[PDB]
């Protein structure tokens, strides 16, 4: 299992836009266009993207290059992160995945937000972070994908994506 397996799991793959849990336009995998309500600027926002007239409908290969520049940018965004950066360093492999996973679908300034929690991580206190983790809105909107990333961070084993 490697980072962008376990990305693959939690977001799907979508080749039509279509709107995420939240109520946003998205394509691919978990690649979020806009969070406007129009169809239309979703549309534009698309073609702007890939730089070709999508109409809402990409290939596989179109999807896989957005994942793989949406993976480095929020890798990238941790290490130039001053918040961020630090808890990357100080974790094993596994659970590097899952901050990034966390970065990739919330943003650098949301996690950032997990003030509390980032602090139990780099202190190695596994299960008083995972508890701390749960206690957000993350975890009340999108329970079963935050249990993955939740446990991925309490174990640092690929325990819970096994099955997926």
Known sequence: ?????????????????????????????????????????????????????????????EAEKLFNQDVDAAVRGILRNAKLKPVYDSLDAVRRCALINMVFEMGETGVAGFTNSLRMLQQKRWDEAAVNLAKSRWYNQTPNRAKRVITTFRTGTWDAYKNL
């Open 1 to 61: 299992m490697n980072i962008f397996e376990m990305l693959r799991i939690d977001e799907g793959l979508r080749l039509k836009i279509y709107k995420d849990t939240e109520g946003y336009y998205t394509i691919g995998i978990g690649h979020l266009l806009t969070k406007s309500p129009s169809l239309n600027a979703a549309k534009s926002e698309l073609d702007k993207a890939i730089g070709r007239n999508c109409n809402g409908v990409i290939t596989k290969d």
